Amino acid sequence: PMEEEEVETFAFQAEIAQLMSLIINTFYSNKEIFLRELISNSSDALDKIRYESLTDPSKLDSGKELHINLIPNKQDRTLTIVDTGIGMTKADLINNLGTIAKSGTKAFMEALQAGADISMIGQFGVGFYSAYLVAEKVTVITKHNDDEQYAWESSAGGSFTVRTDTGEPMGRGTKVILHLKEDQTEYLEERRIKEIVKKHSQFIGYPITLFVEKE
Numbered sequence: 135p136m137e138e139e140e141v142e143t144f145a146f147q148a149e150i151a152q153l154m155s156l157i158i159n160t161f162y163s164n165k166e167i168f169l170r171e172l173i174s175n176s177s178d179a180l181d182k183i184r185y186e187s188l189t190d191p192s193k194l195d196s197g198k199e200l201h202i203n204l205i206p207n208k209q210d211r212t213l214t215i216v217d218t219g220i221g222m223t224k225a226d227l228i229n230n231l232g233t234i235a236k237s238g239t240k241a242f243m244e245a246l247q248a249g250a251d252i253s254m255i256g257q258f259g260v261g262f263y264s265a266y267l268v269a270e271k272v273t274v275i276t277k278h279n280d281d282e283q284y285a286w287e288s289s290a291g292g293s294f295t296v297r298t299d300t301g302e303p304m305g306r307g308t309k310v311i312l313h314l315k316e317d318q319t320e321y322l323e324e325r326r327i328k329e330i331v332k333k334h335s336q337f338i339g340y341p342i343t344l345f346v347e348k349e
């Protein structure tokens with residue numbers, strides 16, 4: 135029997151779309167910082183569940199292990215960043231990933247137009263968008279304790295989709311799947327991933343594991 139699934143397609147808030155076009159259509163040195171931004175978000179999400187768990191231990195029923203997994207796939211050219219953090223509710227997704235204006239957007243774009251390094255993106259509260267430095271398309275699968283699992287996706291172009299995810303369940307946390315541009319395949323190499331994690335993400339207070347598919 136044919137399965138039916140509801141999708142909702144949203145327009146990014148005007149300045150957000152503007153920022154995304156800037157990131158994608160300009161040359162930037164040190165695009166590697168995309169990984170630090172994503173790992174910081176996972177780190178923050180892991181903190182949230184950890185502190186919530188002190189008042190309500192049952193919030194760890196969905197998995198007690200607090201950590202990050204990096205999974206490069208040379209076959210389909212994706213780099214996946216997975217955490218067991220707090221995850222995102224539907225409202226979280228709509229508010230954090232596109233529809234609601236961010237107070238730092240205008241500031242960051244002015245900063246970029248003036249020649250700022252993309253590395254500064256994080257401080258403006260829009261770090262997640264650096265993913266588009268290396269990915270033509272980004273998929274976010276997420277599960278929060280009092281909500282169901284969702285799939286958010288965008289190849290930019292001013293829109294994104296949100297849907298209830300019928301794919302493989304994760305206990306709780308967020309999985310970011312970067313579908314890498316053709317010339318950004320170095321981020322699928324084990325040596326290069328270890329290099330950038332070592333360089334930019336050494337104060338994550340949760341374990342990180344890199345999984346390498348046998349040659």
Ligand SMILES: Nc1nccc(-c2cccnc2)n1
Nearest residue numbers: 175176179219221230262308
């Ligand atoms: N990894 C993770 N976990 C929870 C939330 C987020 C997130 C994404 C994009 C923007 N703000 C927060 N990322």
